[PDB]
């Protein structure tokens, strides 16, 4: 279907962060995400989704 309530599990892909082992304390961890359909979705013919 066109209409989809979803749940997805996203990994941190950045090399320095991901192989790190983190010791005691508290930390700020903040990220940014894109909402533009032509980047987050992908279409077969490569049509402008907006």
């Amino acid at each position: 279907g066109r209409y989809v309530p979803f749940h997805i599990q996203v990994p941190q892909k950045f090399f320095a962060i991901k192989n790190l082992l983190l010791l005691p304390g508290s930390y700020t961890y903040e990220w940014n995400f894109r909402k533009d359909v032509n980047m987050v979705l992908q279409s077969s013919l490569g049509n402008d989704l907006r």
Partner: protein, 45 residues
């Protein structure tokens, strides 16, 4: 550098990867503290 290619009738891009070393050292002196030293050579930041 001089690269020779086929005539393409619609704009294209030459994608060049310069292979360098890109290392990071990570230091945690006290509880909740993190310091980092970055080095990338060739091409220093």
């Amino acid at each position: 550098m001089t690269f020779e290619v086929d005539p393409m009738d619609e704009p294209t891009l030459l994608y060049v990867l310069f292979e360098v070393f890109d290392v990071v050292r990570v230091h945690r002196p006290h509880r909740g503290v993190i310091e980092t030293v970055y080095l990338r050579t060739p091409f220093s930041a």
